[PDB]
Design a protein around this ligand. Sequence first.
Ligand SMILES: COc1nc(OCc2cccc(-c3ccccc3)c2C)ccc1CNCCNC(C)=O
Lengths: 125, 124
Amino acid sequence: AFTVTVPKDLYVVEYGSNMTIECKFPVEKQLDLAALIVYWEMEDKNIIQFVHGEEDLKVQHSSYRQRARLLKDQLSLGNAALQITDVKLQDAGVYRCMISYGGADYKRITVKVNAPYAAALEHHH
Amino acid sequence: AFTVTVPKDLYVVEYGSNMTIECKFPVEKQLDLAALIVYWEMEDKNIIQFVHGEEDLKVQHSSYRQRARLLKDQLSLGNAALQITDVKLQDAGVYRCMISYGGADYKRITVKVNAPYAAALEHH
Ligand SMILES: COc1nc(OCc2cccc(-c3ccccc3)c2C)ccc1CNCCNC(C)=O
């Protein structure tokens, strides 16, 4: 029974930092990239789409353009690792990793973004 | 590549009525149940978990128990098709059909529920 697992449901992130949120999936022996699909999104806005070896950007949101990448190395360890650079308050919310690999599942991750007044005022207006 | 499509992404349903919301996915010749996974949910509540031929009857969310089922005959046609009976105001919201079949994709469907005053409470 194919189960995606998350070591951390919740990340607390400082504005301007970078984060890597992780989804684990079973890999017996060596990853077959041709059978792997990974979607990452937040609030039905798309971040990563990894179909049989390559990312696509085809339904990606601009807010994440040039800021998000999936660590390909980690896939062969069974780790779907999403790195977001230069975290913005807009990045707070609920992420989903959807994984299809001879079986399919998905998990939610909640991200909380702390920021000081200057950053928060800009976001507010 | 593999695309789930929704001809109709908006349903307007009457309280107490029935609805059938549909997602299409391509089938080449004969359907292969072993490769097929169909998952249906609404704003993070499980409705249908159909894995390699078998509906998992015991994982359905309580508020949908005995009201929701996947029309298995429609899969042979490349139509997921979630049939919901005795529609409640709680049924309004965004549904998702997630489909894996030699490829994977998902789509959103919005449901609105019309209801008379008495039903609308609810509300308390
Ligand atoms: C969300 O639940 C499930 N969802 C399933 O289907 C999800 C699904 C189905 C079809 C396609 C996709 C998909 C995959 C990649 C990209 C796009 C869609 C997904 C995530 C199947 C079984 C389950 C139940 N497994 C529970 C195991 N988790 C535990 C024990 O923690």
